[PDB]
């Protein structure tokens, strides 16, 4: 409603870097808000794409940002009569970034890994990896929970159980308020998808450079399955956290599985032991239900609500014809110990191929009326197909069915404006929460400042 669409702020990275593929707000120890920006195709040392991370100080003018430096060198360790190998070429560092406390977590979901033992090998596969930084101190750490040293022949002899070689850890990411990093790994367990959680403090305290294979004993991984409903489900394509079981001492996870059950799609709510509490099934096959998930209380009853994006939902139209426009589903959490019911509200895009629902960002309370609000992205929506971000305001019965404000992409065609969103943070300290919108196609981020209504 009250986002300023006139005076924007633009940050930019190198060309072809996909600057703005992922973003997040970051507060330093003094509470000063910055913008961490992932650029997963930034050139590395050998003039080869490896990705990169930028930490943008808040300036109304915007401009260029300094890099958040990470080790981009391939690693080799000869230990235990084996050879450990990391491969950072085209690893996509910055395909996801997330900030918690004074720590930044930037992940390379396509970092490859291999283990050589004489003539055999584990196979060169994208286990993924995440990089952690404490910018004020310079502390660095890594976390790659799917790295293993099992040779390929063993996986064959054991029928490919507990096969984490293609995890792509850090594909999606989120950190609990207690400081527990939760990684989405959609390729884990032979493309079923898994989750990897470990306290940030323990990641730092157990990491040492050059080890490549180390234990984080406090970590917790989800489980393999023989149920074909989960095969190729990409469990962990998106992840989020929230409170859904009434016990404030436990944190519940929200996992998107957009191809669950033969591409029907699903979203599951689980406890910290990965025990399933709720499952929301997709409405339409191939709609990619669960591509994005958001958790925020929109109707002001103190109970976290769930939002699910299905950006490829095909709406029915006259003469038995379908039109892909995307759809967003709102699930209000019922009072007390009960199951999430049917969707409370359906938001459906209008622009063909607009992919409405590709990203859903909680905004906090934008207009300061007492109800939290959201922004939904249609990265190829709008009458020109350049992309649109639509704001929906919360209300006592959930959400408004019509947007309060629409942000048309300021970038050229193909910028994917809205592919990444982040709100609920006041960056200019005016008392109003603001919205940052990534447009990796144009290698830029736009900042929308909220103003008095």
């Amino acid at each position, epitope marked *: 409603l009250n986002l300023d669409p006139v005076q924007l702020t633009f940050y930019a990275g190198p060309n072809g870097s996909q600057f703005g593929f992922s973003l997040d707000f970051h507060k330093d120890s003094h509470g000063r808000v910055a913008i961490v920006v992932g650029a997963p195709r930034t050139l590395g040392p050998s003039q080869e794409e490896t990705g990169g991370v930028f930490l943008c100080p808040w300036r109304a003018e915007g401009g260029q940002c300094p890099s958040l430096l990470f080790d981009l060198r391939d690693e080799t*360790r*000869n*230990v*235990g*009569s084996q050879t450990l190998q990391t491969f950072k070429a085209r690893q996509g560092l910055g395909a996801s970034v997330v900030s918690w406390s004074d720590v930044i977590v930037a992940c390379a979901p396509w970092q490859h890994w291999n283990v050589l033992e004489k003539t055999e090998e584990a196979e060169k596969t994208p286990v993924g990896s995440c990089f952690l930084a404490q910018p004020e101190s310079g502390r660095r750490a890594e976390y790659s929970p799917c790295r293993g*040293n099992t040779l390929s022949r*063993i996986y064959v002899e*054991n029928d490919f159980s507990w096969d984490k070689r293609y995890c792509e850890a850090g594909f999606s990411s989120v950190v609990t308020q207690a400081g527990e990093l939760v990684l989405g790994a959609p390729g884990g367990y032979y493309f079923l998808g898994l989750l990897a959680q470990a306290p940030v403090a323990d990641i730092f305290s*157990s*990491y*040492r450079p*050059g*080890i490549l*294979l*180390w*234990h984080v*004993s406090s970590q917790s991984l989800s489980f393999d399955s023989s149920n074909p409903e989960y095969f190729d489900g990409y469990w962990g394509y998106s992840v989020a956290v929230g409170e859904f079981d009434g016990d404030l001492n436990t944190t519940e996870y929200v996992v998107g599985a957009p191809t669950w059950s033969w591409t029907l799609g699903a979203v599951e709510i689980l406890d910290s032991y990965y025990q399933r509490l709720h499952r929301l099934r997709g409405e339409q096959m191939a709609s990619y239900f669960g591509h994005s998930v958001a958790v925020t209380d929109v109707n002001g009853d103190g109970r976290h609500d769930l939002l699910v994006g299905a950006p490829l939902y095909m709406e029915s139209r006259a003469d038995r014809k379908l039109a892909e426009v995307g759809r967003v589903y709102l699930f209000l959490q019922p009072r007390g110990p009960h199951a999430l019911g049917a969707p409370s509200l359906l938001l459906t895009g209008t622009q063909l191929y607009g992919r409405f629902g590709s990203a859903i960002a909680p905004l906090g309370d934008l207009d300061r009326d007492g109800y939290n609000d959201i922004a939904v992205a249609a990265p190829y929506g709008g009458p020109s197909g350049r992309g649109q971000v639509l704001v929906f305001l919360g209300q006592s019965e959930g959400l408004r069915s019509r947007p309060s404000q629409v942000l048309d992409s300021p970038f050229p065609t193909g910028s994917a404006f809205g592919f990444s969103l982040r709100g609920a943070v006041d960056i200019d300290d005016n008392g109003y929460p603001d919205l940052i919108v990534g447009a990796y196609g144009a290698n830029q981020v736009a900042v929308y400042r909220a103003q008095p209504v």
Partner: antibody
Amino acid sequence: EVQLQQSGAELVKPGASVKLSCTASGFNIKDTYVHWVKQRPEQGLEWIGRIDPANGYTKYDPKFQGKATITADTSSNTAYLQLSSLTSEDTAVYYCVRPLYDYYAMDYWGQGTSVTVSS
Amino acid sequence: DILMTQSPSSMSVSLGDTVSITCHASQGISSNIGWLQQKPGKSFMGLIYYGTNLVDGVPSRFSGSGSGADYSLTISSLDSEDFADYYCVQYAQLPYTFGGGTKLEIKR
């Protein structure tokens, strides 16, 4: 806290067999490798082998191939070292070892099980 | 197998001294070495892993160094508890192999 609590001292006859135990305390035995190390005053420390309790895959020094058999039961959170066809030279102290962080390290040690072979 | 020649077999020193134990391997092990401590009549305690990294709970007066096939464990300012046996172990190759050992004894 990580603690490896081994079995009591064993007193056996030559030619017999003995099964030493190493129980995980404060952690899951399935977490890391579990090794076995033999110690003698003259010969010193000797690596016997290792097991991955998660799957039961083992490695051995070819010296102990035949006498030493390493197993593990995740249920009881315990690793085992079996010694067959005992000899006076098998009289030694035996330790179970696991790493702290580095997958291949040798950092945490049980108190040690004394073994004495005699008729 | 990789032979680990640890030197010296023993040393007579006093409190506060700065001593260094060396360990030589028959081939390059690229910092894949650990240092161990065995107090008299007791079990073992991990000191160093991967050449230079301290085990959790170990005082900083301990430190590991070296490269290739030559490594060193240094104890700055000896404490009354530091008088014990010390061993180096390589895990660059299987089978793991240990050094002969080093006993720190009180000088008088």
